[PDB]
Design an enzyme around this catalytic site. Structure first.
Site, PDB file in Angstrom:
ATOM      1  N   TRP A  80      32.645  48.629  34.614  1.00  0.00           N
ATOM      2  CA  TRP A  80      31.822  47.464  34.917  1.00  0.00           C
ATOM      3  C   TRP A  80      30.348  47.801  35.069  1.00  0.00           C
ATOM      4  O   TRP A  80      29.547  46.902  35.349  1.00  0.00           O
ATOM      5  CB  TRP A  80      32.320  46.791  36.197  1.00  0.00           C
ATOM      6  CG  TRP A  80      33.769  46.476  36.154  1.00  0.00           C
ATOM      7  CD1 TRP A  80      34.751  47.019  36.928  1.00  0.00           C
ATOM      8  CD2 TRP A  80      34.411  45.545  35.281  1.00  0.00           C
ATOM      9  NE1 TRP A  80      35.968  46.478  36.593  1.00  0.00           N
ATOM     10  CE2 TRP A  80      35.786  45.570  35.583  1.00  0.00           C
ATOM     11  CE3 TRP A  80      33.957  44.689  34.273  1.00  0.00           C
ATOM     12  CZ2 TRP A  80      36.708  44.773  34.913  1.00  0.00           C
ATOM     13  CZ3 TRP A  80      34.874  43.901  33.610  1.00  0.00           C
ATOM     14  CH2 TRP A  80      36.234  43.949  33.932  1.00  0.00           C
ATOM     15  N   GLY A 114      30.122  39.714  39.021  1.00  0.00           N
ATOM     16  CA  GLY A 114      29.603  40.873  39.717  1.00  0.00           C
ATOM     17  C   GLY A 114      29.159  40.590  41.137  1.00  0.00           C
ATOM     18  O   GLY A 114      28.408  41.374  41.725  1.00  0.00           O
ATOM     19  N   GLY A 115      29.617  39.476  41.701  1.00  0.00           N
ATOM     20  CA  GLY A 115      29.267  39.138  43.068  1.00  0.00           C
ATOM     21  C   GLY A 115      27.802  38.841  43.287  1.00  0.00           C
ATOM     22  O   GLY A 115      27.268  39.155  44.356  1.00  0.00           O
ATOM     23  N   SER A 196      34.498  35.427  38.357  1.00  0.00           N
ATOM     24  CA  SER A 196      34.258  36.020  39.672  1.00  0.00           C
ATOM     25  C   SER A 196      32.859  35.797  40.231  1.00  0.00           C
ATOM     26  O   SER A 196      32.659  35.868  41.447  1.00  0.00           O
ATOM     27  CB  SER A 196      34.518  37.524  39.618  1.00  0.00           C
ATOM     28  OG  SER A 196      34.020  38.168  40.777  1.00  0.00           O
ATOM     29  N   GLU A 323      44.442  39.834  42.876  1.00  0.00           N
ATOM     30  CA  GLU A 323      42.982  39.839  42.916  1.00  0.00           C
ATOM     31  C   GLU A 323      42.448  40.715  44.045  1.00  0.00           C
ATOM     32  O   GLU A 323      41.432  41.399  43.879  1.00  0.00           O
ATOM     33  CB  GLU A 323      42.464  38.409  43.067  1.00  0.00           C
ATOM     34  CG  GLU A 323      42.922  37.472  41.968  1.00  0.00           C
ATOM     35  CD  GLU A 323      41.929  37.396  40.835  1.00  0.00           C
ATOM     36  OE1 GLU A 323      42.114  36.560  39.929  1.00  0.00           O
ATOM     37  OE2 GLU A 323      40.959  38.177  40.856  1.00  0.00           O
ATOM     38  N   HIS A 436      41.754  42.334  39.863  1.00  0.00           N
ATOM     39  CA  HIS A 436      40.667  41.393  39.654  1.00  0.00           C
ATOM     40  C   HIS A 436      39.782  41.833  38.496  1.00  0.00           C
ATOM     41  O   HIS A 436      39.305  42.971  38.457  1.00  0.00           O
ATOM     42  CB  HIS A 436      39.842  41.273  40.931  1.00  0.00           C
ATOM     43  CG  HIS A 436      38.588  40.479  40.764  1.00  0.00           C
ATOM     44  ND1 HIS A 436      37.342  40.982  41.069  1.00  0.00           N
ATOM     45  CD2 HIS A 436      38.387  39.220  40.313  1.00  0.00           C
ATOM     46  CE1 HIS A 436      36.428  40.062  40.821  1.00  0.00           C
ATOM     47  NE2 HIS A 436      37.037  38.983  40.364  1.00  0.00           N
TER      48      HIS A 436
HETATM   49  C1  LIG Z   1      35.137  44.725  39.702  1.00  0.00           C
HETATM   50  C2  LIG Z   1      33.815  44.326  38.911  1.00  0.00           C
HETATM   51  N1  LIG Z   1      33.603  42.953  38.360  1.00  0.00           N
HETATM   52  C3  LIG Z   1      32.235  42.809  37.927  1.00  0.00           C
HETATM   53  C4  LIG Z   1      34.622  42.677  37.295  1.00  0.00           C
HETATM   54  C5  LIG Z   1      34.458  41.594  36.307  1.00  0.00           C
HETATM   55  C6  LIG Z   1      33.856  42.013  39.521  1.00  0.00           C
HETATM   56  C7  LIG Z   1      32.928  41.990  40.722  1.00  0.00           C
HETATM   57  C8  LIG Z   1      33.549  42.313  42.088  1.00  0.00           C
HETATM   58  N2  LIG Z   1      32.626  42.274  43.296  1.00  0.00           N
HETATM   59  C9  LIG Z   1      32.012  43.412  43.676  1.00  0.00           C
HETATM   60  C10 LIG Z   1      32.099  44.759  43.066  1.00  0.00           C
HETATM   61  C11 LIG Z   1      33.095  45.666  43.453  1.00  0.00           C
HETATM   62  C12 LIG Z   1      33.162  46.946  42.845  1.00  0.00           C
HETATM   63  C13 LIG Z   1      32.248  47.296  41.860  1.00  0.00           C
HETATM   64  C14 LIG Z   1      31.256  46.383  41.463  1.00  0.00           C
HETATM   65  C15 LIG Z   1      31.188  45.118  42.062  1.00  0.00           C
HETATM   66  C16 LIG Z   1      31.072  43.623  44.814  1.00  0.00           C
HETATM   67  C17 LIG Z   1      30.390  44.837  45.253  1.00  0.00           C
HETATM   68  C18 LIG Z   1      29.510  44.836  46.393  1.00  0.00           C
HETATM   69  N3  LIG Z   1      28.858  46.040  46.796  1.00  0.00           N
HETATM   70  C19 LIG Z   1      29.293  43.642  47.111  1.00  0.00           C
HETATM   71  C20 LIG Z   1      29.941  42.455  46.706  1.00  0.00           C
HETATM   72  C21 LIG Z   1      30.845  42.427  45.545  1.00  0.00           C
HETATM   73  C22 LIG Z   1      31.508  41.152  45.153  1.00  0.00           C
HETATM   74  C23 LIG Z   1      31.276  39.948  45.895  1.00  0.00           C
HETATM   75  C24 LIG Z   1      31.900  38.729  45.533  1.00  0.00           C
HETATM   76  C25 LIG Z   1      32.764  38.680  44.432  1.00  0.00           C
HETATM   77  N4  LIG Z   1      33.391  37.458  44.067  1.00  0.00           N
HETATM   78  C26 LIG Z   1      33.009  39.842  43.689  1.00  0.00           C
HETATM   79  C27 LIG Z   1      32.383  41.084  44.045  1.00  0.00           C
END
Ligand SMILES: CC[N+](C)(CC)CCC[n+]1c(-c2ccccc2)c2cc(N)ccc2c2ccc(N)cc21
Ligand SMILES: CC[N+](C)(CC)CCC[n+]1c(-c2ccccc2)c2cc(N)ccc2c2ccc(N)cc21
Ligand SMILES: *[C@@H]1O[C@H](CO)[C@@H](O[C@@H]2O[C@H](CO)[C@@H](O)[C@H](O)[C@H]2NC(C)=O)[C@H](O)[C@H]1NC(C)=O
Ligand SMILES: *[C@@H]1O[C@H](CO)[C@@H](O[C@@H]2O[C@H](CO)[C@@H](O)[C@H](O)[C@H]2NC(C)=O)[C@H](O)[C@H]1NC(C)=O
Ligand SMILES: *[C@@H]1O[C@H](CO)[C@@H](O[C@@H]2O[C@H](CO)[C@@H](O)[C@H](O)[C@H]2NC(C)=O)[C@H](O)[C@H]1NC(C)=O
Ligand SMILES: *[C@@H]1O[C@H](CO)[C@@H](O[C@@H]2O[C@H](CO)[C@@H](O)[C@H](O)[C@H]2NC(C)=O)[C@H](O)[C@H]1NC(C)=O
Ligand SMILES: *[C@@H]1O[C@H](CO)[C@@H](O)[C@H](O)[C@H]1NC(C)=O
Ligand SMILES: *[C@@H]1O[C@H](CO)[C@@H](O)[C@H](O)[C@H]1NC(C)=O
Ligand SMILES: *[C@@H]1O[C@H](CO)[C@@H](O)[C@H](O)[C@H]1NC(C)=O
Ligand SMILES: *[C@@H]1O[C@H](CO)[C@@H](O)[C@H](O)[C@H]1NC(C)=O
Ligand SMILES: *[C@@H]1O[C@H](CO)[C@@H](O)[C@H](O)[C@H]1NC(C)=O
Ligand SMILES: *[C@@H]1O[C@H](CO)[C@@H](O)[C@H](O)[C@H]1NC(C)=O
Ligand SMILES: *[C@@H]1O[C@H](CO)[C@@H](O)[C@H](O)[C@H]1NC(C)=O
Ligand SMILES: *[C@@H]1O[C@H](CO)[C@@H](O)[C@H](O)[C@H]1NC(C)=O
Ligand SMILES: [Cl-]
Ligand SMILES: [Cl-]
Ligand SMILES: [Cl-]
Ligand SMILES: [Cl-]
EC number: 3.1.1.8
Lengths: 527, 526
Positions: A80, A114-115, A196, A323, A436
């Site tokens: 990602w 990516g939140g 997401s 998820e 997820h």
């Molecule tokens: C797993 C990566 N992703 C981009 C997949 C499509 C999903 C985003 C997940 N995701 C990640 C995250 C986790 C690990 C690596 C990168 C980002 C994240 C990381 C940090 N520090 C803070 C908040 C979040 C976050 C907040 C809300 C939602 N709803 C999804 C989130």
């Protein structure tokens, strides 16, 4: 030669020979000015013109991020991660056209997730060289200012109004509404679809009046604005601007003179700060995201949804089976990538205050008791499967379910899916199941290729959901075919039918996790 | 027919029933009348009487307060005493089959009434049918209840608490020293009670003093681990002092406090027992069992977990609507003359009446746990919910939890589930199988066909009679026939029980496991 005259200039792409055919990929066309200098932390403006023909033929700037390297070298964590160097001039867009150039092909615009702090269009799985050819549709891809650069909100002040990152999308969707007919696209049949944070942004565009004429339908994959992380309260989001300026050494005289200090300092100087801005942070904390700015969003999303002041259209929303498990390896006790990660009773309990810091002890014991009704106790995989469902339902499963329930009340066809298939090439261990964000590989038709070592059952599944994702976009029903396919019924509040997506059997089921989600609807708000 | 006891001779009636006849001895003294000086004190052993007692009439009932909530209603006054009230009430009744048996098994009935009402003299407690069809001996008792039976000043022998329980224990000691001359085995005696005798029989399993008076036990909709069964020694001494100022008797020493209380006429003590508890529940036990140090070494929950109790066979069970009998005694919206449809708010008001001291956050937790309806359209559903939150928390869950911990020490527990509503139930249909209506079928009342009991109610009552008696005799509830489900034992893992209805009796697994899981693992926190 391959050149298309924008209403804006000239851009050329490439030939991408796919599946034994061809697609037209104009990749990296700017839709706004480089937001540096005198115009950053603010909404984007329409781009003027260029005289030299723009070589839109390589992945443009990924917008600056705090790059995740908690496990360096691992694929699933670095998967990602942005594939392009980081900077602030990041407001480009990708768009793949089926070749030969179509007549009025239905347009789909992917909003990456990516939140609201990470994510970039340049990733290998956010790509539509497949979707463009298999179903003969146009796929657009955008990059918006993420983090504090597109979601720093000073309410009312034009110098930082809020949701500028969501305004980047609105301008990116305006570009497709202006000049995608030159590429061969139908500006009237335009479907949004994200994941997401894009699914959250897709739902927010159903609320924003400025977007009610810029798309046709919506697809929400594991995301919605009623999720507890989507929108932050106004006078908590305005606050985290002041603490940011307090952080970068800026004493206040008024509320406008401070912004000019925010601008002078370095880009990565301020993203170093997106972690300390929230003291009681949690792996699902959005330190800088959407908010009520009065321009993009008139009120809090839950109010406009209840009063029915949104774009009346057809939606396609669904979630995955596990998820919540993706967020346990990022801080929860006893959870690692290279274990089987069994836990005892209170590492679940302390595994609750990591995700629920401001909840009473009665609240956490209520969460524990309701997720303790074992089908089999002495099963050692109980408490780790329970914590994954705790994070999963609270943040994505129920927020998507009850949104559809309330969206269905206003008389538009909505369809719900439940993705239960775990891809074979998932690099994370099996205890996290269907994780997820790892269903978009099937959405973009990656298993449709034989050279990625995807098994035949997954490509039949990938071709199945690509066909219905495309059919919903053009027609409004994600039907597979007729005379050999399983019907996908419409989701409505009374029966609550949803479709399962797997390799075993696409079944029709009712009331997904109704017994579990009732806790987060009828009791947990009262704690 | 005349016989001789160890303290005189009794003269008994004869009862022509079922064509045959059965001999009864109603009103035998087993203790000196606790009148005047002897009131509030443990029962003193009886003395010889030069006369020959005529046990040809039901004796007086202990002083209690009449249930005058529904004057003229047979259902409310079915449990009111039929004899005149007096403190001279420590008598017992024996029913003996004809001809006199060899070593017939004995069954001792402990009446209920929340340790405040009840008597052996009720028509529902007539043992003349049990002795005729099974050739067993049934002995009924009368024990002090209310303040005059459970006034607790822990330590002081002037009012040591649990005298009502000692009245029972002395009645059992009377059996093992007289019932042999009557025609019964003293060392094969079974105790069965209901909702306060069930809690009393459950207590006789704990007292080392009564370890030698009976063989096995039968609990019917009651247990000592019920939340209303045992009062802590703290508050039990408040209710004693609260009764003092209500009777104008607050003095220095407890010797003087009991002196004036012993001098005041009985109804001045009786009419004030409704005020000893400030937060009065429809299930509030004003004066009940106490941790006195004589009958109960310590609190009963700690004796069950430690394991100092009589290890034998038990037969426990409840009915499917134990809680609805208490809703028409204070819960708003519920009434006897009305389909008691309640709103959600009338359900919360009802919770505050049955759960006064628990949290508001706790009231929402018991609310939300009991609103996962099978069908949301059902308007009756809020009415049935309150009926079971007070049925499980008070009767169903404690009884299930009792046998689970009792059987874990290597004993044979048999759990039932009485599902059939009697056709003669004088209360309306919305209350279902009400608390205390298993007794008509236990004593075999529907077998006399001169009453308006369906045939389906006789073969049920006739069944329940044999299994109850066979459990007393052989240790397990068999019924000698090929086509009748063999009642398996109740153990911690699989948790099998037998339901009792008219159509046919089937066995099920883990009765109300989901609901009680809330009362076992979550409610003790709130
Ligand atoms: C797993 C990566 N992703 C981009 C997949 C499509 C999903 C985003 C997940 N995701 C990640 C995250 C986790 C690990 C690596 C990168 C980002 C994240 C990381 C940090 N520090 C803070 C908040 C979040 C976050 C907040 C809300 C939602 N709803 C999804 C989130
Ligand atoms: C009268 C019927 N009964 C004896 C069944 C055979 C059951 C007794 C129910 N019962 C009644 C009660 C209710 C209505 C009329 C008469 C008594 C009762 C009444 C008052 N004020 C206070 C406590 C109780 C009580 C406390 C504990 C238990 N476990 C049962 C109780
Ligand atoms: C492709 O489809 C588009 C839209 O689906 C057609 O454009 C118009 O669509 C509207 C629907 O709101 C109709 O009312 C118009 O009549 C359509 N235009 C015409 C000229 O009929 C469009 O015609 C189709 N073809 C192309 C080449 O765009
Ligand atoms: C799914 O259902 C839609 C109807 O909702 C089908 O749509 C028709 O498609 C044909 C061309 O294939 C058009 O000429 C019709 O106008 C469409 N009907 C509409 C828009 O109401 C669609 O074909 C179905 N999917 C498949 C694979 O058959
Ligand atoms: C024994 O305890 C009871 C209650 O626990 C005391 O009675 C009352 O308690 C309620 C509780 O809400 C108070 O509102 C009353 O004010 C108390 N009574 C009085 C007179 O203040 C009772 O007082 C205790 N026993 C003694 C001897 O004090
Ligand atoms: C069965 O029902 C009948 C009524 O249908 C009862 O008859 C009454 O019995 C009482 C005695 O308890 C008499 O005082 C009434 O005069 C009778 N009424 C009539 C209309 O005959 C009968 O008693 C019921 N059976 C039993 C055993 O009580
Ligand atoms: C690109 O693909 C098109 C369509 O297949 C083809 O006509 C053309 O020759 C290819 N090459 C170039 C340089 O356009
Ligand atoms: C504002 O931010 C500061 C930073 O610590 C702190 O007072 C609190 O988190 C916020 N206060 C309010 C009222 O939101
Ligand atoms: C999993 O590995 C982590 C690595 O630190 C360790 O803390 C944890 O105890 C392990 N879990 C086990 C062995 O169950
Ligand atoms: C009645 O009691 C007498 C004793 O007085 C006894 O002899 C007789 O068997 C009893 N039963 C009858 C007469 O049916
Ligand atoms: C006692 O009752 C018996 C019952 O037959 C009878 O002798 C008489 O009514 C009473 N006896 C005396 C001595 O009063
Ligand atoms: C209790 O108090 C009274 C008050 O006069 C006194 O006479 C009596 O002897 C006392 N009894 C004891 C046992 O202390
Ligand atoms: C049921 O009867 C009681 C008796 O007062 C009454 O308060 C209640 O409102 C009645 N229920 C209905 C639905 O009328
Ligand atoms: C029940 O138990 C007794 C004693 O163990 C035995 O004689 C009798 O046959 C049993 N009844 C059945 C139906 O097995
Ligand atoms: Cl003591
Ligand atoms: Cl109590
Ligand atoms: Cl005192
Ligand atoms: Cl018969």
């Amino acid at each position: 030669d391959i050149i298309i005259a924008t209403k804006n200039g000239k851009v050329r792409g490439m030939n991408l020979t796919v599946f034994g055919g061809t697609v037209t990929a104009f990749l990296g066309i700017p839709y706004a000015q480089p937001p540096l200098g005198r115009l950053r932390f603010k909404k984007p403006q329409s781009l003027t013109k260029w005289s030299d023909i723009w070589n839109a033929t390589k992945y443009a700037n990924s917008c600056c991020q705090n790059i995740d390297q908690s496990f360096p070298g691992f694929h699933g964590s670095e998967m990602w991660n942005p594939n392009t160097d980081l900077s602030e001039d990041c407001l480009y867009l990708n768009v793949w056209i089926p070749a030969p150039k179509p007549k009025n092909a239905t347009v789909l615009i992917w909003i990456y997730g990516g939140g609201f702090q990470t994510g970039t269009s340049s990733l290998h799985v956010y790509d539509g060289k497949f979707l463009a050819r298999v179903e003969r549709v146009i796929v657009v891809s955008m990059n918006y200012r993420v983090g504090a650069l597109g979601f720093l909100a000073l309410p009312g002040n034009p110098e930082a109004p809020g949701n500028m990152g969501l305004f980047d999308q609105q301008l990116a969707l305006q570009w497709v509404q202006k000049n995608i007919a030159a590429f061969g696209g139908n500006p009237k049949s335009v479907t949004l679809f994200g994941e997401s944070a894009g699914a959250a942004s897709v739902s927010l565009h159903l609320l924003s009046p400025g977007s009610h004429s810029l798309f046709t339908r919506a697809i929400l994959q594991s995301g919605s604005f009623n999720a507890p992380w989507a929108v932050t309260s106004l006078y908590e989001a305005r606050n985290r601007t002041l603490n940011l300026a307090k952080l970068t050494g800026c004493s206040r005289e008024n509320e406008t003179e401070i912004i000019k200090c925010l601008r002078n300092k370095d880009p990565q100087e301020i993203l170093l700060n997106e972690a300390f801005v929230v003291p009681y942070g949690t792996p699902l904390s959005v330190n800088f995201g959407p908010t009520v700015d009065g321009d993009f969003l008139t009120d809090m999303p839950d109010i406009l949804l209840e009063l029915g002041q949104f774009k009346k259209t057809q939606i396609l929303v669904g979630v995955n089976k596990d998820e919540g498990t993706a967020f346990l390896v990022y801080g929860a006790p006893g959870f690692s990538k290279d274990n089987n990660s069994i836990i005892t009773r209170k590492e679940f309990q302390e595994g609750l205050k990591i995700f629920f810091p401001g909840v009473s002890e009665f609240g956490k014991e209520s969460i524990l008791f309701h997720y303790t009704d074992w089908v089999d106790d002495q099963r050692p995989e109980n408490y780790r499967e329970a914590l994954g469902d705790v994070v999963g339902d609270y943040n994505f499963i129920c927020p998507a379910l009850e949104f559809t329930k309330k969206f269905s009340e206003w008389g538009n066809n909505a369809f719900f899916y439940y993705f239960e298939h775990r891809s074979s090439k998932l690099p994370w261990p099996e205890w996290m199941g269907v994780m997820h964000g790892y269903e978009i590989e099937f959405v973009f038709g990656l298993p449709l290729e034989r050279r990625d070592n995807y098994t035949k059952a997954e490509e039949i599944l990938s071709r199945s959901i690509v066909k219905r994702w495309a059919n919903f976009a053009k027609y409004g029903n994600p039907n597979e075919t007729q005379n050999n396919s399983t019907s996908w019924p419409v989701f409505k509040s009374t029966e609550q039918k949803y479709l399962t997506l797997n390799t075993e059997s696409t079944r029709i089921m009712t009331k997904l996790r109704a017994q579990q989600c009732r806790f987060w609807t009828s009791f947990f708000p009262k704690v």
